[PDB]
Design an enzyme around this catalytic site. Structure first.
Site, PDB file in Angstrom:
ATOM      1  N   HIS A   1       1.077  15.073 -12.110  1.00  0.00           N
ATOM      2  CA  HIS A   1      -0.012  14.776 -11.170  1.00  0.00           C
ATOM      3  C   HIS A   1      -0.960  13.809 -11.816  1.00  0.00           C
ATOM      4  O   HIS A   1      -0.852  13.520 -13.018  1.00  0.00           O
ATOM      5  CB  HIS A   1      -0.739  16.045 -10.779  1.00  0.00           C
ATOM      6  CG  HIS A   1       0.049  16.904  -9.856  1.00  0.00           C
ATOM      7  ND1 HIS A   1      -0.485  17.445  -8.717  1.00  0.00           N
ATOM      8  CD2 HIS A   1       1.358  17.251  -9.867  1.00  0.00           C
ATOM      9  CE1 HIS A   1       0.456  18.109  -8.070  1.00  0.00           C
ATOM     10  NE2 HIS A   1       1.587  18.002  -8.745  1.00  0.00           N
ATOM     11  N   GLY A   2      -1.869  13.292 -11.007  1.00  0.00           N
ATOM     12  CA  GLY A   2      -2.834  12.304 -11.446  1.00  0.00           C
ATOM     13  C   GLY A   2      -2.194  11.113 -12.115  1.00  0.00           C
ATOM     14  O   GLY A   2      -2.766  10.595 -13.058  1.00  0.00           O
TER      15      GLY A   2
ATOM     16  N   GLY B   1      -7.737  10.572  -9.447  1.00  0.00           N
ATOM     17  CA  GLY B   1      -8.726   9.522  -9.184  1.00  0.00           C
ATOM     18  C   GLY B   1      -8.630   8.261 -10.022  1.00  0.00           C
ATOM     19  O   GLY B   1      -7.788   8.140 -10.930  1.00  0.00           O
TER      20      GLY B   1
ATOM     21  N   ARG C   1      -5.238  -5.699  12.780  1.00  0.00           N
ATOM     22  CA  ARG C   1      -3.929  -6.135  12.339  1.00  0.00           C
ATOM     23  C   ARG C   1      -4.037  -7.217  11.283  1.00  0.00           C
ATOM     24  O   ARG C   1      -3.231  -7.260  10.376  1.00  0.00           O
ATOM     25  CB  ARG C   1      -3.089  -6.576  13.520  1.00  0.00           C
ATOM     26  CG  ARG C   1      -2.736  -5.406  14.415  1.00  0.00           C
ATOM     27  CD  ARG C   1      -2.166  -5.919  15.710  1.00  0.00           C
ATOM     28  NE  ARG C   1      -3.006  -7.002  16.255  1.00  0.00           N
ATOM     29  CZ  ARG C   1      -2.782  -7.611  17.427  1.00  0.00           C
ATOM     30  NH1 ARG C   1      -1.740  -7.254  18.197  1.00  0.00           N
ATOM     31  NH2 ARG C   1      -3.593  -8.586  17.820  1.00  0.00           N
TER      32      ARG C   1
ATOM     33  N   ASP D   1       1.187  18.323  -0.504  1.00  0.00           N
ATOM     34  CA  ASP D   1       0.498  18.156  -1.763  1.00  0.00           C
ATOM     35  C   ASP D   1      -0.729  19.097  -1.846  1.00  0.00           C
ATOM     36  O   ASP D   1      -1.594  19.137  -0.925  1.00  0.00           O
ATOM     37  CB  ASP D   1       0.122  16.677  -1.889  1.00  0.00           C
ATOM     38  CG  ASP D   1      -0.415  16.292  -3.256  1.00  0.00           C
ATOM     39  OD1 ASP D   1      -1.330  15.438  -3.242  1.00  0.00           O
ATOM     40  OD2 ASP D   1       0.058  16.795  -4.319  1.00  0.00           O
ATOM     41  N   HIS D   2      -0.781  19.875  -2.939  1.00  0.00           N
ATOM     42  CA  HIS D   2      -1.944  20.693  -3.293  1.00  0.00           C
ATOM     43  C   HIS D   2      -2.352  21.701  -2.233  1.00  0.00           C
ATOM     44  O   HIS D   2      -3.520  21.726  -1.825  1.00  0.00           O
ATOM     45  CB  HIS D   2      -3.163  19.826  -3.623  1.00  0.00           C
ATOM     46  CG  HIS D   2      -3.057  19.084  -4.919  1.00  0.00           C
ATOM     47  ND1 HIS D   2      -3.461  19.623  -6.121  1.00  0.00           N
ATOM     48  CD2 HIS D   2      -2.630  17.829  -5.196  1.00  0.00           C
ATOM     49  CE1 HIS D   2      -3.267  18.739  -7.087  1.00  0.00           C
ATOM     50  NE2 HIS D   2      -2.762  17.641  -6.552  1.00  0.00           N
TER      51      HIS D   2
ATOM     52  N   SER E   1      -4.069   7.022  -5.654  1.00  0.00           N
ATOM     53  CA  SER E   1      -5.139   6.053  -5.937  1.00  0.00           C
ATOM     54  C   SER E   1      -4.678   4.594  -5.968  1.00  0.00           C
ATOM     55  O   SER E   1      -5.334   3.721  -5.412  1.00  0.00           O
ATOM     56  CB  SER E   1      -5.853   6.436  -7.235  1.00  0.00           C
ATOM     57  OG  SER E   1      -6.401   7.741  -7.094  1.00  0.00           O
TER      58      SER E   1
ATOM     59  N   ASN F   1       3.438  11.721  -9.026  1.00  0.00           N
ATOM     60  CA  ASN F   1       2.454  11.692  -7.952  1.00  0.00           C
ATOM     61  C   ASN F   1       1.546  10.474  -8.026  1.00  0.00           C
ATOM     62  O   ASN F   1       0.939  10.247  -9.037  1.00  0.00           O
ATOM     63  CB  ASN F   1       1.625  12.968  -7.979  1.00  0.00           C
ATOM     64  CG  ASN F   1       2.380  14.162  -7.478  1.00  0.00           C
ATOM     65  OD1 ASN F   1       3.615  14.163  -7.380  1.00  0.00           O
ATOM     66  ND2 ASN F   1       1.646  15.206  -7.152  1.00  0.00           N
TER      67      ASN F   1
HETATM   68  O1  LIG Z   1      -6.696  -7.449  28.831  1.00  0.00           O
HETATM   69  C1  LIG Z   1      -6.420  -7.539  27.606  1.00  0.00           C
HETATM   70  C2  LIG Z   1      -5.094  -7.423  27.160  1.00  0.00           C
HETATM   71  O2  LIG Z   1      -4.102  -7.198  28.075  1.00  0.00           O
HETATM   72  C3  LIG Z   1      -4.814  -7.552  25.794  1.00  0.00           C
HETATM   73  C4  LIG Z   1      -3.405  -7.448  25.232  1.00  0.00           C
HETATM   74  C5  LIG Z   1      -3.076  -8.625  24.295  1.00  0.00           C
HETATM   75  O3  LIG Z   1      -3.228  -8.246  22.910  1.00  0.00           O
HETATM   76  P1  LIG Z   1      -2.305  -8.823  21.698  1.00  0.00           P
HETATM   77  O4  LIG Z   1      -3.281  -9.706  20.939  1.00  0.00           O
HETATM   78  O5  LIG Z   1      -1.175  -9.560  22.382  1.00  0.00           O
HETATM   79  O6  LIG Z   1      -1.805  -7.611  20.936  1.00  0.00           O
HETATM   80  C6  LIG Z   1      -5.866  -7.784  24.904  1.00  0.00           C
HETATM   81  C7  LIG Z   1      -7.180  -7.897  25.363  1.00  0.00           C
HETATM   82  N1  LIG Z   1      -7.470  -7.782  26.672  1.00  0.00           N
HETATM   83  C8  LIG Z   1      -8.835  -7.894  27.172  1.00  0.00           C
HETATM   84  P2  LIG Z   1     -10.097  -8.236  25.941  1.00  0.00           P
HETATM   85  O7  LIG Z   1     -10.263  -6.968  25.135  1.00  0.00           O
HETATM   86  O8  LIG Z   1      -9.688  -9.416  25.100  1.00  0.00           O
HETATM   87  O9  LIG Z   1     -11.323  -8.498  26.812  1.00  0.00           O
HETATM   88  O1  LIG Z   2      -1.235  12.948  -7.267  1.00  0.00           O
HETATM   89  C1  LIG Z   2      -2.255  12.794  -6.578  1.00  0.00           C
HETATM   90  C2  LIG Z   2      -2.429  13.593  -5.461  1.00  0.00           C
HETATM   91  O2  LIG Z   2      -1.407  14.472  -5.225  1.00  0.00           O
HETATM   92  C3  LIG Z   2      -3.612  13.466  -4.681  1.00  0.00           C
HETATM   93  C4  LIG Z   2      -3.800  14.351  -3.445  1.00  0.00           C
HETATM   94  C5  LIG Z   2      -5.235  14.793  -3.143  1.00  0.00           C
HETATM   95  O3  LIG Z   2      -5.720  13.873  -2.159  1.00  0.00           O
HETATM   96  P1  LIG Z   2      -6.766  14.220  -0.968  1.00  0.00           P
HETATM   97  O4  LIG Z   2      -8.003  13.482  -1.425  1.00  0.00           O
HETATM   98  O5  LIG Z   2      -6.912  15.716  -0.954  1.00  0.00           O
HETATM   99  O6  LIG Z   2      -6.104  13.655   0.261  1.00  0.00           O
HETATM  100  C6  LIG Z   2      -4.584  12.501  -5.064  1.00  0.00           C
HETATM  101  C7  LIG Z   2      -4.383  11.712  -6.217  1.00  0.00           C
HETATM  102  N1  LIG Z   2      -3.233  11.845  -6.953  1.00  0.00           N
HETATM  103  C8  LIG Z   2      -2.884  11.124  -8.184  1.00  0.00           C
HETATM  104  P2  LIG Z   2      -3.858   9.666  -8.574  1.00  0.00           P
HETATM  105  O7  LIG Z   2      -3.216   8.656  -7.642  1.00  0.00           O
HETATM  106  O8  LIG Z   2      -5.296  10.000  -8.304  1.00  0.00           O
HETATM  107  O9  LIG Z   2      -3.588   9.459 -10.038  1.00  0.00           O
HETATM  108 ZN   LIG Z   3      -2.222  15.411  -7.849  1.00  0.00          ZN
END
Ligand SMILES: O=c1c(O)c(CCOP(=O)(O)O)ccn1CP(=O)(O)O
Ligand SMILES: O=c1c(O)c(CCOP(=O)(O)O)ccn1CP(=O)(O)O
Ligand SMILES: [Zn+2]
Ligand SMILES: [Zn+2]
Lengths: 318, 319
Positions: free
Chosen positions: A205-206, A174, A275, A82-83, A251, A248
């Site tokens: 676009h946009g 935007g 997560r 893109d662009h 936003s 495109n």
């Molecule tokens: O040792 C670990 C570890 O093995 C994990 C994996 C489990 O994550 P999940 O939630 O299963 O994706 C996470 C944390 N810690 C230490 P801390 O950063 O909590 O002190």
């Molecule tokens: O179509 C596009 C587009 O191609 C871009 C790329 C430029 O982004 P960057 O900031 O350079 O990563 C952004 C917006 N829009 C449409 P809209 O969703 O703003 O209406």
């Molecule tokens: Zn665009």
């Protein structure tokens, strides 16, 4: 499989449907899109701006894209730059394995545009890569905006050889496209004219809708995006019928993700596992995209055609 | 390049340093970690939980790891399966090209622990892949059922199973609330040297986020409700390291560094809605949190100490 913009939009034009083209920047954004298009067996354009590539250090986005290609070998998937501003970035994207590029020289005068574009078209078409370019400039009408002149468009396309042309009809980048929602002024009349004269797939676009649901949500939970307006969606469906094949969209996703995060942050201030909020943000992207794909018309079409590989695409250009 | 757990922790052991094992979930996380270890020329363990594999439908997470292995060929990089529960969860990961696995049978009795492990050890060792296992269970010391590692048992466990490295239980636990307050730190690090002497292998410390001041304060400044968060003091970890702990598992610290950064953007610039605008900052804060931590663990400057033995040539250490 990795598809060209040439074929993908070839098929869009033919069946009078539009394919959403969705900017991605990380793993959760690609997953949010892929989810949406797999469900509706829709072809998809995943597009990355030069900024996207910088943010993901380039290789990270490549590999994430390779993951979406391997995870879903049923879907035609076009990876698009893109662009592009220069031949330089077009090169960088090609070497990363993209199946399409956009060269945006719309801001230089006509001949410089045509100059700069032929250069990229010569380069890109050697490897089978499609080329979107643009004539006319982005920005609302309500001033220094040049809306595409259809007769120039025809010539531009004959002179340059591009697979797709991005048009200028009053849309901008935007979340703040129009000042009021009373005064949404689109020049979609010329789209059919441009489509007829050039004979090729056109690109809007946009094209974000700034949907009120998501907007209010951001503002409701700490955000400050108050007078935000987008392009109405029936306008996009109208433009699709008139020859627009690529829509495109960036936003709208940005906002979907951000709304779901602020919501987790407000409702559950005690949570710190990314997560917990990024997951909801992924799913918000999917939910917002599903109606949109359905309106665009691309749903059900993923198995229509045999995807041509880039190697074989070289033949279209000899 | 890709690097076994055996070689990475073998070097850490011989030079008396530890290598941080960081849990990975998505792009901005792998990047944050890699910017840090790259800047400090440190080896790294990138570890994947079963739950992080779920989060990312595996392949996405597979591919991020490749991007880091490929972006930074200079750095020794062990891809490690954290907390493998079954023998089959191990299989799944070796095939996603992992260099190392944990089989966690610490909640089963000794004999069932040794058995479940030797199984994973047999499968893993034959494909050159490293195996971490655990004796003793995580939990705070302060009615009890937490099973701290008995150094005599550990000696027998490594003699029976043949594991490459051993996770020990010394009073840590997962998450942000390891102790009731900053004055109530009750850890069992004295046994570390005896476990290390008696078993002769690298040891791993689970549950070892430090919950640094800056990270917690930024979460709590910008709308966050984590007032009583407390982790392992870095001093304790450095103590443990020099007695034989060679791998240190850190996850909550990165989760907290990311959230603070996003909450502060959410407050200082409420107009901003591009996720790059807050996840980039969240990536950067990960990196900055991790710089002092990596140096304390001691692995800074050691990325080029050794030529990395391939999974392939690792098949010989055992055969
Ligand atoms: O040792 C670990 C570890 O093995 C994990 C994996 C489990 O994550 P999940 O939630 O299963 O994706 C996470 C944390 N810690 C230490 P801390 O950063 O909590 O002190
Ligand atoms: O179509 C596009 C587009 O191609 C871009 C790329 C430029 O982004 P960057 O900031 O350079 O990563 C952004 C917006 N829009 C449409 P809209 O969703 O703003 O209406
Ligand atoms: Zn665009
Ligand atoms: Zn653990």
């Amino acid at each position: 499989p990795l598809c060209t913009l040439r074929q993908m939009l070839g098929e869009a034009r033919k069946h009078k449907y539009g394919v959403g083209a969705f900017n991605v920047n990380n793993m959760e954004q690609i997953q949010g899109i892929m989810k949406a298009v797999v469900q509706l067996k829709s072809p998809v354009i995943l597009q990355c701006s030069r900024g996207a590539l910088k943010y993901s250090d380039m290789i990270y986005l490549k590999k994430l894209c390779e993951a979406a290609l391997e995870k879903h070998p049923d879907i035609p998937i076009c990876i698009h730059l893109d662009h592009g501003d220069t031949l330089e970035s077009v090169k960088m994207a090609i070497d990363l394995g993209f199946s399409s590029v956009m060269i945006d020289a719309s801001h230089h005068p006509f001949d410089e545009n045509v100059r700069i574009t032929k250069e990229v078209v010569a380069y890109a078409h050697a490897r089978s890569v499609s080329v979107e370019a643009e004539l006319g400039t982005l920005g609302g009408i309500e001033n220094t905006v040049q809306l595409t002149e259809p007769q120039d468009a025809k010539k531009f396309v004959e002179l340059t050889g591009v697979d797709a042309l991005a048009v200028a009809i009053g849309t901008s980048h935007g979340a703040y496209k129009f000042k009021s929602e009373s005064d949404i002024r689109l020049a979609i009349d010329r789209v059919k004219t441009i489509s007829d004269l050039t004979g090729i797939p056109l690109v809007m676009h946009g094209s974000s809708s700034v949907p009120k649901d998501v907007k209010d949500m951001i503002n409701k939970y700490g955000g400050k995006m108050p007078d935000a307006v987008g392009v109405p969606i029936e306008s996009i469906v109208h433009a699709i019928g008139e020859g627009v094949c690529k829509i495109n969209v960036d936003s709208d996703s940005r906002m979907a993700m951000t709304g779901a995060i602020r919501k987790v942050f407000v409702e559950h201030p005690e949570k710190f596992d990314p997560r917990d909020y990024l997951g909801p943000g992924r799913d918000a992207i999917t939910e917002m995209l599903i109606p949109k794909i359905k309106a665009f018309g691309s749903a059900g079409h993923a198995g229509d055609y045999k995807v041509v590989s880039l190697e074989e695409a070289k033949a279209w250009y000899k």
